[PDB]
């Protein structure tokens, strides 16, 4: 079991969970039967490549470790150089333009490329959120998590839909690292934070311009509360109400739903699977952007259940699982230990 709030086990389980989500989810980038069939093939060697989700998470974490702090110039450069070195990881069509501009040594304003995206409105993709878990490992306070989730996200994702998705994901990880909670209290804390954020005029403006409801993440969290109280919620219901898409708004709430729903056993998923495995399986069964939804659900679940629920056979199937683990331990030593 995962032990105290912000334990080493929780740190390790968080990054391993994210890696598992990316690697296993990537196979389907779908039905529950087919997923269950496919995961049997993990049972008894870095055979599953990671994608942009992990590549960016690793750069983000390496920046934090390098500076023992957030440094936007260092982080932007690490993202750009990681892309330069290994461009075929499955980066979004939009965000590669950001990396190209950052690679220009004349670029001394590292937030400006992201702001120019999509006719100056910014990306609303889930790429800011997919990599953000490291932020919550580095920072314990809600205040710092919000601040640095936003800043890290804004390096590529300047739309409030994009960066607020990243904050929500980081807040979910923040909470999961604290250990045992009712699903009620977990969801309620998230709702409260997003209601606070969606009172800001930039959030209200971005939402209105995109033709959405007035406080979008808040509305989705309320929907999650309803779904968690509803009988026999089907994949159709989840996907139609929450989404399974590349947009942050259609993937971050979904990931959180998968975590909360899978806190309890489910007779549709064999009992031999543990809670972390169940969460990953369920999230992939939703289809769509299985890679990023599973990566995000995995980060939350990993933080909550800890490393003892990370199956060696799954973990050792993933490219770079040892590097991922070292980074988690390093985050714990530098920012959690003294
Ligand atoms: N403001 C936007 N207008 C139109 N499409 C967008 C917008 N923001 C994101 N997208 C879509 O989402 C995709 C992924 O976003 P992008 O920022 O490239 O990468 P990431 O997957 O890292 O979020 C884009 O290639 C595009 O298809
Ligand atoms: Mg990916």
From Swiss-Prot:
Disease implication from the record:
Neurodegeneration, childhood-onset, stress-induced, with variable ataxia and seizures: An autosomal recessive neurodegenerative disorder characterized by pediatric onset of progressive brain atrophy, developmental regression, and seizures in association with periods of stress, such as infections.
Q: What is its EC number?
A: 3.5.1.-, 3.2.1.143, 3.2.2.-
Q: Does the keyword Cytoplasm apply?
A: yes
Q: What is this protein called?
A: ADP-ribosylhydrolase ARH3
Q: What is the effect of changing residue 126 to A?
A: Partial loss of activity
User: In UniProt terms, what is the effect of altering residue 289 to N?
Assistant: Significant loss of activity
What is the cofactor note?
Answer: Binds 2 magnesium ions per subunit.
Reported effect of changing residue 125 to E?
Answer: Reduces hydrolase activity
- Outcome of substituting residue 51 to R: Abolishes hydrolase activity
Ranked from the top, the taxonomy reads: Eukaryota, Metazoa, Chordata, Craniata, Vertebrata
UniProt superkingdom: Eukaryota
Mainly localized where? nucleus
């Amino acid at each position: 079991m995962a032990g105290a709030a912000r334990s080493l086990s929780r740190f390790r389980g968080c990054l391993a969970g994210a890696l598992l989500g990316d690697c296993v989810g990537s196979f389907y980038e779908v039905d529950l039967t087919s997923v269950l069939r496919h995961v049997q093939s993990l049972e008894p060697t870095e055979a599953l490549y990671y994608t942009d989700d992990t590549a960016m998470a690793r750069a983000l974490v390496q920046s934090l470790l390098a500076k023992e702090a957030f440094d936007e110039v260092d982080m932007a450069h690490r993202f750009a150089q990681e892309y330069k070195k290994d461009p075929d990881r499955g980066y979004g069509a939009g965000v590669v333009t950001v990396f190209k501009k950052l690679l220009n040594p004349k670029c001394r304003d590292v937030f400006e490329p992201a702001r120019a995206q999509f006719n100056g409105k910014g990306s609303y993709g889930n790429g800011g959120a997919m990599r953000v878990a490291g932020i919550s490992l580095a920072y314990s306070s809600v205040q710092d998590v919000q601040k640095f989730a936003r800043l890290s996200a804004q390096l590529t994702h300047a739309s409030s839909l994009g960066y607020n998705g990243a904050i929500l994901q980081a807040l979910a990880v923040h909470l999961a690292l604290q250990g045992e909670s009712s699903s009620e209290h977990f969801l309620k804390q998230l709702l409260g934070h997003m209601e606070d954020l969606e009172g800001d005029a930039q959030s209200v403006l971005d939402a209105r311009e995109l033709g959405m409801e007035e406080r979008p993440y808040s509305s989705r969290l309320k929907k999650i509360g309803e779904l968690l109280d509803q009988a026999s919620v089907t994949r159709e219901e989840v996907v139609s109400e929450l989404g399974n898409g590349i947009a942050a708004f259609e993937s971050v709430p979904t990931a959180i739903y998968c975590f909360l729903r899978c806190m309890e056993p489910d007779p549709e998923i064999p009992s031999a699977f543990n809670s972390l495995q169940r969460t990953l399986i369920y999230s992939i069964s939703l289809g769509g952007d299985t890679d990023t939804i599973a990566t995000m659900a995995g980060a939350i679940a990993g933080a909550y259940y800890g490393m003892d629920q990370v199956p060696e056979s799954w973990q050792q199937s993933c490219e770079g699982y040892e590097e991922t683990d070292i980074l988690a331990q390093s985050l714990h030593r530098v920012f959690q230990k003294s």
